Amino acid sequence: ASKRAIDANQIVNRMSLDEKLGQMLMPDFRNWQKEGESSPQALTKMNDEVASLVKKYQFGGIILFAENVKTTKQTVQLTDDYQKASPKIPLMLSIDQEGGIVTRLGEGTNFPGNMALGAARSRINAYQTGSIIGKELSALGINTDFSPVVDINNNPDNPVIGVRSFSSNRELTSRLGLYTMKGLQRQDIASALKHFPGHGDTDVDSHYGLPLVSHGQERLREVELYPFQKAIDAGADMVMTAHVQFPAFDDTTYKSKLDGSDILVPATLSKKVMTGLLRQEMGFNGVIVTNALNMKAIADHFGQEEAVVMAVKAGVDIALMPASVTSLKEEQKFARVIQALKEAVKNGDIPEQQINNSVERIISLKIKRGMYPARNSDSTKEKIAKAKKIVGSKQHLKAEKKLAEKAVTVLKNEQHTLPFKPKKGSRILIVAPYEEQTASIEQTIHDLIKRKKIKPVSLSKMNFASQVFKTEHEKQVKEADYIITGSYVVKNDPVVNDGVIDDTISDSSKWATVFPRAVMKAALQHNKPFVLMSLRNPYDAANFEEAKALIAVYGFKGYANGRYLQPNIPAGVMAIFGQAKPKGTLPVDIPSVTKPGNTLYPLGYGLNIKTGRPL
């Protein structure tokens, strides 16, 4: 590893301060309003206006969004067109391909998500997930991924990250995060631990619109920072930092450049936090990178040019999205940002050696993940061919399937309700919040029929988001022979009275709690098989203590425009019809609604769908 250290330095010493500064910038070109074009457009394809700016400011990286990677053919092209534009050093192309409810690739393999991998628990599954996203990203020409999220969803009453997080436990989070990370690296992909110093239990400041952490240092070091520490020791490449007001480690305030008020310093802009805590006390010598510096709150309260400078002064190595430049009319923004830096350095506000370090860390990362020198040598056409047989491939899809199905978590199964074994002719009533969800379940039961794994049955759908359970809906439940219902909640806000959920109170506003619970009473009333499939946060499982079949899948996206947007719903359905073997155990604690203060389903709990005994 001492072979990168010198290599990197030999290189930095030969760069103009301007090539060094540009190399610490990583803007986004999500939307671009061309010359003499009516408005801004999703940038699907390169052009001389954007590429000029790359040649000119010589950025160190470009971050990509859903707009930029709509299709596999378009993506592999846009990447190679970027690499052409980049004058001297291979760009570091990055993206938020976490898996689960946060994916970006258009034709790529969306996985069950972190909280799913938590339920699955096996650390090999995590490593496979990263290894595949890695293969996929690598095949497109993307080399950096802002995953793993190692935030900890430890507070039901405040699930800021929820299913994007492995677990409510620090050890399960750090471990799974540890292996997702290593998975990605094995594919030669820069991996960035996400949301330092721990976004999972952030309060908010309604005044400024920033996340605030009010916890003291003992707590912070026990919980929030633990996952990051362990991954940092294990050789994390990058650490992404959120704009979180962080008073236990820095309670420096500034004057808002918009309010005049005394605003706490965001973690990102604090030398005590960036350099003091992360760089020194924690030992992180990788690349530090920040949330979008052009986020409104930040831009408005600290100023754009000023904020990027504060961040670099504070220790970050890569200022992400330093300004919002959509046209060539706005191109002088990048000039100013670099100019602020050039000046703050000339002044000795930022030692030249500090810049040389940062850049030497980027150049070291680029060398370490084979971005530098550029390791490929295939026609863009050939890259595209190779990519189409890799991104979204049947092999990957199978693994996605096995993983989603392994993660399904059975919480109740009284008297073998599951699996459903329908007679020919049986009517299955499918009930979810949105059409794309009832569609996914339907499409899945449909394949099972075409594949002769179940007798032919008849399906109707009921979509209840914002609805109230009225007579119409109840007649439709009598008609049914089998009922599959999806619950969807973030925070669990059942109307309740001394532990007794109140069912006599239904209004449109309470739909995510009152409605599915009304289906359930309706189905019990007429002696129907009813399983409940929770689609997001497992907390809603406390709403269905009377039910006899209950499962969690940790992923709510459905079926649309001919494509499955997530594996979770299908996997649930397969386990309901005895097709898959659900292994899942709770990666979080489900609080009881009927006996407040107690846990209803503890961490690690999960049933063997066949034997009925705790997995």
Question: 185: closest CA among 286, 319, 103, 291?
Answer: 286
User: CB of residue 83 vs Na ion: minimum separation in angstroms?
Assistant: 6
Nearer to Na ion, 80 or 400 (CB): 80
Long-range contacts, 441-448 (Cβ 8 Å, 24+): 441/484, 441/486, 441/569, 441/570, 441/573, 443/559, 443/564, 443/570, 444/569, 444/570, 444/573, 444/574, 445/573, 445/577, 448/573, 448/574, 448/577, 448/579
In whole angstroms, the minimum distance from the beta carbon of 133 to Na ion comes to 16
Please give the Cα distance from 456 to 468 (Å, whole number): 31
Cα 262–Cα 263–Cα 265 angle in degrees, nearest 5:
130
- Judged by beta carbon, residue 79 or residue 326, the one nearer Na ion is 79
To Na ion, the closest distance from the beta carbon of 374 in angstroms equals 9
Choices 73-81, 306-314, 341-349, 593-601 (CB under 5 A): range interacting with Na ion: 73-81
Helix (H, G, I), strand (E, B), or coil: what is residue 367?
helix
* Under rule CB under 5 A, residue 144 binds Na ion: no
CB of 584 to Na ion, least distance (A): 37
Closer by beta carbon to Na ion, 84 or else 329: 84
Tokens standing for 449? Answer: 């029929």
Q: Which is nearer to Na ion, 343 or 378 (CB)?
A: 378
250 contributes a contact to Na ion by CB under 5 A:
no
Segment interacting with Na ion (CB under 5 A) among 78-86, 331-339, 501-509, 564-572: 78-86
Q: Which of 58, 79, 144, 169 binds Na ion (CB under 5 A)?
A: 79
Rounded distance, CA 139 to CA 184, Å?
A: 13
Which among 135-143, 199-207, 462-470, 598-606 is the span making contact with Na ion, rule CB under 5 A?
135-143
The smaller minimum CB distance to Na ion, of residues 79 and 440, is found at 79
User: Whose Cβ is closer to Na ion: residue 375's or residue 446's?
Assistant: 375
SS3 of 145, please? strand
Contact 548, 417 (CB under 8 A): yes
Task: Provide the CB-side half-sphere exposure for 347 (13 A, CA).
Answer: 10
* CB 575, CB 410: distance < 8 Å: yes
Q: How far is the CB of 81 from Na ion (least distance, A)?
A: 9
**Strand bridging mode 41-42 / 427-432:** unpaired
Minimum distance from residue 55 beta carbon to Na ion (Å): 18
Q: Does 90 bind Na ion (CB under 5 A)?
A: no
Q: Is residue 304 near Na ion by the rule CB under 5 A? A: no
CB of 204 to Na ion, least distance (A): 40
Find the farthest-apart pair of alpha carbons in the chain and give their distance in angstroms, rounded. Answer: 81
The rounded distance, in Å, linking the Cα atoms of 355 and 346 is: 12
Q: Which stretch binds Na ion (CB under 5 A): 1-9, 72-80, 166-174, 200-208?
A: 72-80
Nearer to Na ion, 79 or 245 (CB): 79
Residue 196 CA neighbour count, 13 Å, CB half = 32
Q: Is position 201 an interface residue for Na ion (rule: CB under 5 A)?
A: no
User: How many residues lie near Na ion (CB under 5 A)?
Assistant: 3
Nearest distance in Å: CB 79, Na ion: 4
Question: Of all residues in this chain, which one has the CB nearest to Na ion in the complex?
Answer: 141
Q: Which helix (H) or strand (E) holds 530?
A: strand 530-534
- Which segment (74-82, 89-97, 227-235, 408-416) binds Na ion by CB under 5 A? 74-82
Minimum CB distance to Na ion smaller for 83 or for 202: 83
From the list 87-95, 141-149, 211-219, 502-510, the region that binds Na ion by CB under 5 A is: 141-149
CA distance 28 to 42: 12
Return the residue of 20, 22, 80, 97 that touches Na ion, per CB under 5 A: 80
Bond preceding residue 516 cis, omega within 30 of 0: no
Q: How far is CA 111 from the centre of its chain?
A: 11
CB of 383 to Na ion, least distance (A): 5
Segment near Na ion (CB under 5 A); pick from 84-92, 117-125, 140-148, 412-420: 140-148
- Is residue 141 a contact point for Na ion (CB under 5 A)? yes
Question: Which of 441, 440, 399 lies closest to 420 in space, CA to CA?
Answer: 441
The DSSP secondary structure of 28-95, one letter per residue, reads B-SEE--TT-SS-EE--S--HHHHHHHHHH--S--B--TTTTSSHHHHHHHHHHHHHH-SSS----EE
Question: Please, what is the minimum distance in Å from the beta carbon of residue 375 to Na ion?
Answer: 11
Of the pair 79, 103, the CB lying nearest Na ion is at 79
Q: Can you give the binding site for Na ion, defined by CB under 5 A?
A: 79-80, 141
